[model samples]
Target: TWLSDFPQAWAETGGMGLAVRQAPLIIPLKATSTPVSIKQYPMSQEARLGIKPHIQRLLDQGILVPCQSPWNTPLLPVKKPGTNDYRPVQDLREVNKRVEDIHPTVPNPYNLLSGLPPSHQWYTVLDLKDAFFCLRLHPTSQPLFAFEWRDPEMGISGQLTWTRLPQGFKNSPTLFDEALHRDLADFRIQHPDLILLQYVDDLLLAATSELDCQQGTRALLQTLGNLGYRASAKKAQICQKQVKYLGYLLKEGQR
Candidate 1:
């Protein structure tokens, strides 16, 4: 009886986009599901920034709860055929603001202090790939997410739904940035002189010279990758006298 009216509506008009979305089929995550193991070694550049504390802090904060949905298969964003945008009402509804702590007012670019000597002259930046996926979510909070899919070809016809944490959500970037900033607040590290700028996963770093940049880059790559994330060579930059971070302009020999 539950599928009676629903399947009838679906069969009459296949792409009506009503039945599955409105009547969501929900489920729970399996206890043993694990983070996807990346085949590419040294997974991402994000690992280099000593980001274990950020992961630990989120776990400590009860923000991320574990859950299962479809694996990382590329699905088309539901959109109008002519225009490439999804319904604005649905999109806006999906991105409701999650309440969070107050963030520090970001410092001005000129006020930023790299603490490096004048001898060095270049710098580099590295970025991590699939940041949140690298860390494991707690198994206890697995039932708070949902998904919708009805593939008649593969006999897949149901919308599975639950709620926990959705990666790529709008709040993800702000949450990540604040987490990393908190982690580095009391950090004590030496050599090469690193500056960590985080916007979700994109990071920008700078150093006094090329050699310093090299050491800084190497340290970040080794550090962050060891934890679990991967760094992409394509997104990284090397030995630049001027760099920008978090919307602030950075330059050497100035301030």
Candidate 2:
């Protein structure tokens, strides 16, 4: 009911699109090196077909664009095992090895949670959908993530590059953490009464009372909206007495 007040803050899923940042990202290369073009991994007919929709969805989102580049990598289609589904994977091992990493630091979950007061029982958890996709990948770095796809049944075959950060990139976590940190820095400093903990895109806001918790949750949602981030209503637990944050159940006094 609390989320109903601000429907614009919620999305069916996070990771819907890129959150244009103030500055364009430059993915640094490790050094002067030759372009590495790895061959595509073999997949069954079913696998290829299953992966087609996912690739098309990324294309539809403008996350993937048709491109021609000296650097190219193969796509890894993984079956969900229990289900008739496939996850499109960009094998970035070769690229990650050559790319220079920012080596950004993230907050420790243990230390982050330890700061919350024992008396603060009311809690809310917000998870950013497709967190990394919210950030745009600069054109210079987009080609480094190019992957090849060909579906005989669909008569589709071409090279596609990621305009947004791909999920499997080695530096994605650090980059996203830093980006989100920059966006939330001011708010975190301003709201000392509310405990704000972030592990990548997951946000945990803890407060002492239901009123405080609800207000903090509303404020957080509003801030996320202003910053071009989307929180998934399905994954959020708003104004709850107990909440699971970063794999730990947070209660009144004890974890």
Candidate 3:
């Protein structure tokens, strides 16, 4: 099976691993722009302890770095649905207001299936793991994403900045989408046989046969991996005639 064929390329199912970008990120902002620093919001002891470990993990990965930056944002602990875990969220409203949004790169969901014909029988889908965190934030603009965090258990607190493109930032989706498109440009050009569609971090690949689907899926995964991206193994639907893409059931050449 292809899983055995590329063991090193597959990451843990629904993992938090990040990918690095080969191209330098271009953030549209002046170096001398006035910085904004919002004070941290209050949270309960349990809330503080809950998100501390996740924050530390990000710190260990260099995804988050300690900073004495002028810009600061408050962190909010969001409880995951159906779970006790909390995901840290940085309130970037102040920063988002200042950042210039890039042109929209998100493909229209309705139009994604427009060109596919009855001949395309096999399908594959991929959801990028830690999609925004895959791309590095430019050092010059890193300060714009600084946030305050404290650990009650460890009795430590400090401001930290994102080294990667973060969630809640206004331009993150467009930036990451464009980067992923560029990375897949060569593969798309080389394999015209595979039908490809991308909506930000979600990918849809369609082909005419199981063998073709497997081949395309392997190539796509390999290409993404070579460019430092990882797809959630649990979220991938490979070499299947019937699959789901963008909330719609796909089967027998229909959405």
Candidate 4:
């Protein structure tokens, strides 16, 4: 029911989002930075197969594009904890070293939780799906994140880079958090009665009443979709009197 209510806010329906409200990021390189191209690590046939569809998904969504660039990174196929499945993650250590560092604006989880006033017990939690991917990348900076790939089954092989922000980059969390904060400014101002705390891609909204919580949640979900951010419906915990937030369960204004 929740999925149907906000189709554009679910990852299954929305796929990868592009933060239309925020400006595309122009990644800065360090003054002494130089191009570094790391070869992709060897993966098992099954593991490679697992990665193929992931790449295709990105391709189909236009989040990734074929490219040729001096800078490259390894796309590692890491195994899921208890499954035969694998997920693709870039090895960006080299690129991270070359990228200019920015001050971290992401709040510490503990410090962030204190903002939840005791009076606001009703809560709705959401974990943003692929949060970094919502932010777009500038074409000039796109080349900096390229990675080599080959699919003999399709008779094609080349470098593929992300059109949106790639994960594994050090600054991704901070950048995404700040961008989402800026995008939610209007919602925050309009609904000063609502208590919304965001730590990177995870959001916790609290209210004094269930009715307010329900209203605020619908508004938040709509605002997120309008700004090109999607929340995972599977992980959403809609209006409830007692709930776990920031790893603590709060009930009747008690944590």
Which model, 2 or 4, shows the larger lDDT?
4
Measured by lDDT, the strongest candidate is 4
TM-score of each: 0.49, 0.92, 0.92, 0.94
How many angstroms is residue 37 displaced in model 1 relative to the true structure, after the best TM-score fit? Answer: 31
How do these models rank on TM-score, best leading? 4, 2, 3, 1
User: How many pairs in model 2 have backbone atoms within 3 A of each other, for residues 3 or more apart or on separate chains, i.e. clashes?
Assistant: 4
lDDT per residue for candidate 1 within 181-200, as digits (tens), equals 54434322654255554555
> Residue 139 error for model 1, in Å?
3.5
- The per-residue C-alpha lDDT of model 3 at residue 111 equals 81
Can you write out model 3's per-residue Cα lDDT over 44-133, one digit (the tens) per residue? 877887888888899888899988888898899899878687778888898887776667867688986786778888889888888888
Clashes of each: 32, 4, 0, 0
> Residue 138 deviation, candidate 3, in Å?
1.6
TM-score of 1: 0.49
Error of 3 at 18 (Å): 5.4
Comparing 1 and 3 on TM-score, the stronger one: 3
Q: lDDT values of the candidates?
A: 0.40, 0.81, 0.80, 0.88
